[PDB]
């Protein structure tokens, strides 16, 4: 009938393993081929836009926190593309779960060849690594790609990856089984969502980079990674007495570090 | 070989002298 409802989770500061991000497929069309621009810039004909229907794009994944990069960007391994951009590659990020603060993001940039020794950004997308209540993102996510720009790692990001937006979530919930199934009704409703989707395909030149996050499994359980800090349970033993000690001093019984620095330099 | 080291160093200057001579001849063409 069904396994139980227990919610299992691990603290992010307890999961000392590298974060891994799957770069799935890049759906959508590119910015056509504006031949006006090529007459102005002949180097532009020697660029992935104009050489193949699917240039061999690559993605760089970098983690940012407080607008600063936590480590170097990781690049997808070369994959030759012909009719679709499908890297299908798990990227081991240089950051571990304990290393990630609550506002850690991954800035993902799709890059293309622009003449010799020059990559142009096809687009960029940034998604926060923790959810609205501090749970590491799980499973398959489709991120809005911002054309002709690198992913922005600043806080707040200017390239967030997160009608069809709402419906896709409901569709994913339906496919996972969280939405109730009604065959007569699902058959009719999804045709409309398809019409909406096709209209959005024609209306806008949007691209989506589908990515996936790893699932933490142990004994066939599913653990969500919730953001925590070690000692996060240490509710400080604050007490409101001031009978004798009216003026607390935090440095009270502490090594004088300016004298020890001096000791270490004179003696 | 019996050609001395000193004589070979002279032929090096001769071959080079012709090498740069052929290079200028190339640029004219």
């Amino acid at each position: 009938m069904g396994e139980a409802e227990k919610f299992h989770y691990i603290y992010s500061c307890d999961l000392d393993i590298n974060v891994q991000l799957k770069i799935g497929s890049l759906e959508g069309k590119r910015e056509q081929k504006s031949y006006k621009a090529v007459l102005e810039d002949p180097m532009l004909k020697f660029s992935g836009l104009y050489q193949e229907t699917c240039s061999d794009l690559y993605v760089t994944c970098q983690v940012f926190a407080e607008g600063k990069p936590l480590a170097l960007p990781v690049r997808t391994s070369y994959k030759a593309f012909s009719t679709r951009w499908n890297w299908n590659e798990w990227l081991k990020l240089p950051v571990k779960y304990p290393d990630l603060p609550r506002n850690a993001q991954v800035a993902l940039t799709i890059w293309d060849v622009y003449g010799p020794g020059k990559a142009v950004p096809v687009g960029g997308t940034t998604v926060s690594l923790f959810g609205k209540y501090g749970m590491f993102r799980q499973g398959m996510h489709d991120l809005k790609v911002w054309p002709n720009v690198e992913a922005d790692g600043s806080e707040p990001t200017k390239t967030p990856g997160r009608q069809m937006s709402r419906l896709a979530k409901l569709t994913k919930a339906h496919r996972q089984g969280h939405m109730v199934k009604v065959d007569w009704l699902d058959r009719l409703t999804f045709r409309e969502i398809e019409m909406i989707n096709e209209s959005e395909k024609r209306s806008s030149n949007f691209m989506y980079l589908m990515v996936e996050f790893r699932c933490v499994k142990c004994d066939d359980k599913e653990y969500g990674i919730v953001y925590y800090e070690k000692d996060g349970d240490e509710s400080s033993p604050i007490l409101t007495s001031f009978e004798l000690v009216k003026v607390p001093d935090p440095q009270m019984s502490m090594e004088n570090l300016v004298e020890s620095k001096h000791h270490k330099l004179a003696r | 070989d019996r050609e001395r080291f000193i004589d070979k160093k002279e032929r090096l200057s001769r071959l080079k002298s012709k090498q740069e001579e052929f290079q200028k001849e190339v640029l004219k063409a």
Partner: protein
Amino acid sequence: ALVKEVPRNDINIYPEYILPGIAHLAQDDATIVRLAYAENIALLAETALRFLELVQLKNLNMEN
């Protein structure tokens, strides 16, 4: 990096205090910290070197 001056008591701060003080971070258990040392060692070493130069400009005046 902001230190453009060398107080006469701090002539030996890098050899004896700062470099020995952070040396444990190069072998740190967390990779994030060794990444931090890898990022900043070039600028730390350059700043220590600039610091040593400023010591000589001071010493040269003291001899002169």
